[PDB]
Symmetry: C3
Subunit: 529 residues, 3 copies
Amino acid sequence: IKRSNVFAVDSQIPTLYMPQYISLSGVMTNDNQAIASFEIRDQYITALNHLVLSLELPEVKGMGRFGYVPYVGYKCINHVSISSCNGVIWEIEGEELYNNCINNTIALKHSGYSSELNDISIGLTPNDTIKEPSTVYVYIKTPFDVEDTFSSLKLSDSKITVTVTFNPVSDIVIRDSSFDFETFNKEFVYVPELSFIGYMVKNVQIKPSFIEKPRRVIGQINQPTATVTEVHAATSLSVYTKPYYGNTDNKFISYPGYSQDEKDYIDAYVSRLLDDLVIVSDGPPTGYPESAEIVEVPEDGIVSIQDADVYVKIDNVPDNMSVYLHTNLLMFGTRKNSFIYNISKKFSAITGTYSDATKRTIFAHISHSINIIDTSIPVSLWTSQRNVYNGDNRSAESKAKDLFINDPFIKGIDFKNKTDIISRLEVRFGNDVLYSENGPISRIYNELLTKSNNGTRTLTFNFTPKIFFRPTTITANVSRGKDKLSVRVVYSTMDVNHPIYYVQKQLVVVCNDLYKVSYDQGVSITKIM
Amino acid sequence: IKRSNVFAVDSQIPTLYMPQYISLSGVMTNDNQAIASFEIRDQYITALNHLVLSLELPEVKGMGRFGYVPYVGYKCINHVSISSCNGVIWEIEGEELYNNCINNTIALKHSGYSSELNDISIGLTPNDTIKEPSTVYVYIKTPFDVEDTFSSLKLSDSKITVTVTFNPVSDIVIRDSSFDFETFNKEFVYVPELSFIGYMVKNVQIKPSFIEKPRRVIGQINQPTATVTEVHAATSLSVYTKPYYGNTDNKFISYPGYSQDEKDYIDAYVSRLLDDLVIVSDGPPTGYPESAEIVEVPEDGIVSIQDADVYVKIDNVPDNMSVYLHTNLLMFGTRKNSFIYNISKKFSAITGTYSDATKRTIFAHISHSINIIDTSIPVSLWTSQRNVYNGDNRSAESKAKDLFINDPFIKGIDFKNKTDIISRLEVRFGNDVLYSENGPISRIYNELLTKSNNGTRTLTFNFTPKIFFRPTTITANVSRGKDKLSVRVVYSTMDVNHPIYYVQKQLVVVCNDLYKVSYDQGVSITKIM
Amino acid sequence: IKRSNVFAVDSQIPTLYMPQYISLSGVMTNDNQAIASFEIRDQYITALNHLVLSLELPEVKGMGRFGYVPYVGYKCINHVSISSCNGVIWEIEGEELYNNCINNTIALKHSGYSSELNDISIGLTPNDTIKEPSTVYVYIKTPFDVEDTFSSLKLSDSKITVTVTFNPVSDIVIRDSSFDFETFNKEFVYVPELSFIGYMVKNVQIKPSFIEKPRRVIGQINQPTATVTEVHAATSLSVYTKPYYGNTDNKFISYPGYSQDEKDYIDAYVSRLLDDLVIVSDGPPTGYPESAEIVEVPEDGIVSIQDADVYVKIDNVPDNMSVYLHTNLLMFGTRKNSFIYNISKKFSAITGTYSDATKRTIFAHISHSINIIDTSIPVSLWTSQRNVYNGDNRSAESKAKDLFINDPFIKGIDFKNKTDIISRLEVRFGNDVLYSENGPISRIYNELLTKSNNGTRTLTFNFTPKIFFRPTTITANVSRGKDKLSVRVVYSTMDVNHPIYYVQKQLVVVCNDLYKVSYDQGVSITKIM
């Protein structure tokens, strides 16, 4: 019995090298999209990987409510490209980069995720500081990071250029109307610095490698189809939907800030609704539109709103004041005398205590049925032409606290991507059906295999180890016409009298193509056919 | 100096294959245990792994309090078996499957763990919907998943059958007496679908492999011994205890629902006790049994309960009402005039405010010594024959809110498996002592080595990589009689006047046997001797 | 096309061995530092790894406030050394051991991290039990654990000695002045037990290996320089700063106990300040020093404190009482009529309700600007000679609740190591500059590469797999004088009128040297040159 020794190893002497952390400042150029270019030319840098982008956010002064989106560093990136003299080596969109890093909690934390950055801070005077200057770090995960020095990008005596395109500053900022965003936008400038790990290698022996490069296709608005052409060697395919808020002003009622659980979203929304829902006043409350229906709460504390009973009990109400309930705070309906969507009927029990000192109701326990979709409705959709009612019956004070939100990486139709609006998915390679499903079993598989919490519907064709094998791909057959991937979905049917039915959707299809990387005459890549 | 190249690899071309996600519907057969069978016969399916079971839970309508246990998908599974024409290939119990997946947070989340499923929802009218229809996904982790395609189950032109046995629906449901469980049970049916990843391989070269199959032995009620016979090649051995609630009605006072921390359990329990503990009333409170001792709280706010001082201060008590304290809410004792277990003496400070509108006391800060064992006591044990007192002096209203809980995967004597009731463990291989310990150092080691939070006392005999080596086992010596593993424990001594002393216990011993998998004449396994 | 089989393996038969868990009691010897020695001499133990130290903490009785620091098991360890007959094989400081385990959440949990151990418990009578006896487990991670049996420490027929030096018990205890620490210290004794996994190997074939041993250098108080000499083969270098609280009594105002978030620290601090900040009294509040400035809150609820407006609104104040605000609770300043640091001016809105029953103010919402540095100020620094004011104007009651905290593993100048006090870092190998940076990009890299949340500024020179290659090092050139590593930093500039400016700092430099491990004539190590 010849036995393999599992208590000792014969240590290999590795290639002689020395690593170094290297920072570079960029050249910035500019609706004038901001672009940073970083030039890497150094004869003693043989390979590199682990790119990190530094961004200095400035001091924010003035009046209004201002905050940064979570993961602001990732969300300010529109596009990243690595090139040489022979053309582009590897590139990615900001959405797909953020997708690839969504499971790296450390990287997400470094890119800007804290109370200081992401709470909605309030400025009271034109000289009040709303945010202090800060620095975020964006880990640009590339295929050259999977196996450390084995997968690194070798600079075969070539000059490597890294180009970063930035999103407009309105994408990364949550603000109210009181904040002077025009001035802020005129003054804001991205200040980037690029870092990487370089390797000074002694007598490097270079071999050709393989690289996967994502390619992204967005369908037209509300179409259930998208197609990616010229597919010859794909390792994976993923499909998801994005909301198109272009038909709105991008104003929402609430945003939970640094708290990012579904419960947190719902709590912020309910908190914003309670100030206009239950009113302690001397006589009929004033300052609400004519369409508002404010009723007094009887001695039994129960108000009926057409099949719905709301239980209101407030402590310490003065003897000259009564408790009032808003029975149609937000209303939606497409036909005049049919079903109505009423945000007031989603409450069952409201208790609290009136404060004589601050003249407010401090709410204690609330029983309600608000979900994430309601927190995700845009304010424009409550008052669209299709609504036969006056949708928004809130006070002017609460109307003034709505927030502009322009986050570019939102999936689905809600902030959490919690509702699945795809009820059937079909993929075709050429004309034949490659995959079909009704439930999200492919998303279950993507999450199980990548150990992620925010998976998408994904067909993965590669199950081999990463760089020590050539990746397994679905291969084209141009003779039989199998050279394109077509995706058709069936959207989940929503009620025509729910405002979320009118959020516009786009289908996104991402394809990972296989490329050969060769190192004769500098660095170059060729698409595998 | 010959140096190993650590900056380049020679990529191997792997076996030509194509993966595919495959779903199957089953054949259901039926105290009529429900059994689902899934048949896999497909000539182009060469291998498979990554089994996922889909379960559609129906709409739940009616009155009462209803909820699902956490991880309902895992808890509805009694047994899973994979077979071919030559017999069983691999099988497992539901408890051990859940044990093997306890460290996979993604899988646990997919099997049904959310507020919507696990809050105890309340139905008010016979047409109220308590739960909406939902789908859970149970990842059935098999030994064929450890190394992706290397460890996959090859179908040597054989038909593979997957059989799932389900637990009764009462195991996965938390309910009160007001819910119509008889009708619910008559109507509930499991609707399962089986998914796996199949591989269509071109010219597969098959080699024999090794597989570990768990074998489970449960000792008799309250015996400190269990033995597993016919042990010839075990890779690991684990020991834990389970509570036997068969001598009870399985009714508990509280359950925290979706919150699953120890603090959450304790908070739910204290919340259920406070409504009968402190009473604001006009005169001596009514509606309590004769054995209740309700005393008025003096001006200093301190009530003495035999060496115990409780500090009660309630704000806003009306002038016609007084504050009362329940001094023997739950009581236990075995001898008439000796030590008594009194749930009231476990409180030291109770403060709150009376609400005139809702006629309740809203409690603020509470100081207490309630632990997890108290939340884990069954209501039947408070009123057993051995209790010389009337144990339960609660109001009928609170008595009506007790929950039936029949969770099948509970370890220890509390819901969290927090108390260790094993004070000494001894394992014998044959007649010789193989292992001995007093503290839980083997559980510490199991958690450290498996990177788990819910480890058990485990002897692992294998420290070699998984599939690239033959596993290391403890080998039998039938000549010397070393062919069985005997386990004897010494239970921690509990006080005879604590009700948890009378919870019945079973010892569970799990043994992982090594099997050879061969592929001539289809798939077959043979026990290593 | 020769294809590598990725669906089958040729299983290797490994070395024949049998593992066993082994516990040992020690020999304890003793300002009399406690030292435990464990002797391992057993002919059938061929290798070992995975050391775990058991510690029994006793019952704590008496009066006062008492608690254990988080991770008490790690914090009681001063030094660990593994030796043979040829000298020390491997050793480490307690700080660096805890650093190496900071990312192992399971190990941190096992070493003592729970509400029961880490809440500040209160003893009321001299016989009250503050803490029950408990056992913690400290995983002593060694280089012999990285690759299981491949990296294990082989005992070439040698006797191995493990020696543990313990910190004084005052390092692991958080206490007030009311606790009798002199008696506690006279009675406390460490009771340790050592566990490891031993391997009984049949015909072991031993080969020489490599090991990295940390070496630690602490700079002098407040010097921005430190140097590690005799550096010939280092795999990594890390730099951080520690606070020196020797010029204080080590008393702080608050400690959050088991809650260990920054928000938790701030909340505990604000809670301790509110009792003296806002006072509901009949007339000017009494019991405060003469330097206190207590003003009555006007009808509009706004008090001005030199450019700062505090909004105070308390409900249910009796008609004979008024609301008062402490305008200089904690004050600091170095010049008589210049800038002042006033803890009262860091509040903007204070609301709450007075309780007539308990005669206290129960605070509801608070708006403030307290940060982690304020919670990290020592009480001695408020009343130093450099303060031209009476710094601490709190009541005697709150002064009596300050806690002694002597935690030995604190980094930076705050409890969370959140503020970076290093604005520039430079490393020199010999006289040449090896590395330079202004921001913490090296800490970003350390966290990204080690997947940690508490990284330090680190230069790592090794990117090769751990034990199957010889590690890559930065190599000395004694001819050119490159045989020492010098570190110089520039500290962040703090305001001279902030008390945190006067916390003393030490620079810590840790170097990982490469050693050869050989097994002829027992175990021995030699420093690589």
